[PDB]
Scaffold this motif. Structure first.
Motif, PDB file in Angstrom:
ATOM      1  N   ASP A 105       0.957  -1.061  -0.114  1.00  0.00           N
ATOM      2  CA  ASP A 105       0.183  -0.019  -0.137  1.00  0.00           C
ATOM      3  C   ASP A 105       0.919   1.395   0.032  1.00  0.00           C
ATOM      4  O   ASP A 105       1.479   1.421   0.846  1.00  0.00           O
ATOM      5  N   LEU A 106       1.118   1.821  -0.937  1.00  0.00           N
ATOM      6  CA  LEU A 106       2.132   2.781  -1.250  1.00  0.00           C
ATOM      7  C   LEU A 106       1.584   4.105  -0.699  1.00  0.00           C
ATOM      8  O   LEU A 106       0.664   4.506  -1.389  1.00  0.00           O
ATOM      9  N   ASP A 119      -2.389  17.867  -4.587  1.00  0.00           N
ATOM     10  CA  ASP A 119      -2.609  17.047  -5.897  1.00  0.00           C
ATOM     11  C   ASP A 119      -1.362  16.579  -6.497  1.00  0.00           C
ATOM     12  O   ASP A 119      -1.348  15.500  -6.895  1.00  0.00           O
ATOM     13  N   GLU A 120      -0.349  17.618  -6.536  1.00  0.00           N
ATOM     14  CA  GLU A 120       0.731  17.049  -7.609  1.00  0.00           C
ATOM     15  C   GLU A 120       1.481  16.153  -6.721  1.00  0.00           C
ATOM     16  O   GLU A 120       1.787  14.885  -7.377  1.00  0.00           O
ATOM     17  N   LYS A 121       1.518  15.856  -5.478  1.00  0.00           N
ATOM     18  CA  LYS A 121       2.368  14.758  -4.764  1.00  0.00           C
ATOM     19  C   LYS A 121       1.359  13.361  -4.905  1.00  0.00           C
ATOM     20  O   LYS A 121       1.926  12.549  -5.043  1.00  0.00           O
ATOM     21  N   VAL A 122       0.174  13.766  -4.997  1.00  0.00           N
ATOM     22  CA  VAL A 122      -0.925  12.321  -4.890  1.00  0.00           C
ATOM     23  C   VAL A 122      -0.645  11.809  -6.127  1.00  0.00           C
ATOM     24  O   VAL A 122      -0.511  10.944  -6.569  1.00  0.00           O
ATOM     25  N   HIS A 152       1.581   7.712  -9.984  1.00  0.00           N
ATOM     26  CA  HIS A 152       2.790   7.327 -11.142  1.00  0.00           C
ATOM     27  C   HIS A 152       3.819   6.360 -10.348  1.00  0.00           C
ATOM     28  O   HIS A 152       4.248   5.360 -11.139  1.00  0.00           O
ATOM     29  N   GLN A 153       4.184   6.536  -9.322  1.00  0.00           N
ATOM     30  CA  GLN A 153       5.104   5.946  -8.638  1.00  0.00           C
ATOM     31  C   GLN A 153       4.465   4.397  -8.301  1.00  0.00           C
ATOM     32  O   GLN A 153       5.367   3.265  -8.348  1.00  0.00           O
ATOM     33  N   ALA A 154       3.140   4.134  -8.218  1.00  0.00           N
ATOM     34  CA  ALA A 154       2.742   2.955  -7.840  1.00  0.00           C
ATOM     35  C   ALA A 154       2.704   1.775  -9.101  1.00  0.00           C
ATOM     36  O   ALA A 154       2.585   0.682  -8.956  1.00  0.00           O
ATOM     37  N   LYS A 155       2.868   2.627 -10.479  1.00  0.00           N
ATOM     38  CA  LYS A 155       3.081   1.798 -11.615  1.00  0.00           C
ATOM     39  C   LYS A 155       4.614   1.706 -11.667  1.00  0.00           C
ATOM     40  O   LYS A 155       5.088   2.429 -12.479  1.00  0.00           O
ATOM     41  N   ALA A 188      -2.003  -1.350  -3.986  1.00  0.00           N
ATOM     42  CA  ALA A 188      -2.746  -0.068  -3.325  1.00  0.00           C
ATOM     43  C   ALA A 188      -1.777   1.269  -3.386  1.00  0.00           C
ATOM     44  O   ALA A 188      -0.851   0.973  -3.046  1.00  0.00           O
ATOM     45  N   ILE A 189      -2.654   2.360  -3.382  1.00  0.00           N
ATOM     46  CA  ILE A 189      -2.125   3.557  -2.794  1.00  0.00           C
ATOM     47  C   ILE A 189      -2.748   3.895  -1.589  1.00  0.00           C
ATOM     48  O   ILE A 189      -4.100   3.554  -1.567  1.00  0.00           O
TER      49      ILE A 189
END
Ligand SMILES: *C/C=C/c1ccc(Cl)cc1
Length: 242
Positions: A13-14, A18-21, A26-29, A37-38
């Motif tokens: 669960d990463l 909004d920019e950081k979300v 992006h990082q989860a892919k 999950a995120i």
């Protein structure tokens, strides 16, 4: 280690404007697969969902947190927060168990709080994880008791920690909680989540090995096991050659 790292990555669960979300999404892919999950605060769920859909990873789950990180014992507040999380579009809600109330001898409020949240979640096909805060409970007996109450009240997962106190997961608290799952006969329906205490790929392998030894190596799929920890994804990717 490569095999364990890939496995752990897909159970993450990463967590991290909004920019950081969006960047989280992006990082989860990752180059070797998607995290499970995120994990974001409730208000961030809509923009997270939009981002996951736009990048073609709509099956990455969105988890959030309620009654958090305090684990207060006001059921109406925890329920309101959980209903709001559901309404925002959560796939999963990680609620903090009222661990201070348990330490003060009140088992019933924990049962009632988890159950109320579970009823709301179940109505919306949302998974409920319950954070028992093993680092504040400290005692084996209290960790078992919080785990038992949570499961009896309908937790879909029991989770070690908020990540917001001095002491988060340890291997021993992980073992105790998974033993409860086993002893209660609920390994089909209840997962385990490790939060904190898992800095490295080597750490993740050790935590997975506990599950493998207790339940067998096929048990720890994304419905039954998750990880979250600062720095872990980077360590897993490094182990995998990224
Ligand atoms: C267990 C989940 C912890 C957590 C902390 C902070 C955010 Cl934004 C999400 C999830």
């Amino acid at each position: 280690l490569k095999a364990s790292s890939l496995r752990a990555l897909k159970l993450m669960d990463l967590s991290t404007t909004d920019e950081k979300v969006i960047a989280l999404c992006h990082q989860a892919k990752t180059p070797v697969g998607n995290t499970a999950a995120i994990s974001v605060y409730p208000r961030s769920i809509p923009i997270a969902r939009k981002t996951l859909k736009e990048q073609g990873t709509p099956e990455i789950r969105i988890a959030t947190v309620t009654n958090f990180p305090h684990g207060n014992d006001d059921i109406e507040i925890a329920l309101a927060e959980t209903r709001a999380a559901i309404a925002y579009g959560a796939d999963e809600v990680d609620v903090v168990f009222p661990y201070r109330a348990l330490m003060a001898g009140n088992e019933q409020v924990g049962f009632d709080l988890v159950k109320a949240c579970k009823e709301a979640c179940a109505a919306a096909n949302v998974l409920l994880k319950v954070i028992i805060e093993t680092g504040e409970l400290k005692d084996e007996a209290l960790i078992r008791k919080a785990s038992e109450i949570s499961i009896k009240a309908g937790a879909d997962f029991i989770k070690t920690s908020t990540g917001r106190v001095a002491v988060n997961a340890t291997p021993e608290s992980a073992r105790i909680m998974m033993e409860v799952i086993r002893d209660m006969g609920v390994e089909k329906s209840v997962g385990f989540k490790v939060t904190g205490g898992v800095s490295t790929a080597e750490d993740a392998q050790k935590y997975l090995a506990i599950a493998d030894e207790l339940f067998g190596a096929d048990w720890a799929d994304a419905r039954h096991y998750r990880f979250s920890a600062s720095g872990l994804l980077a360590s897993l990717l490094k182990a995998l050659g990224h």
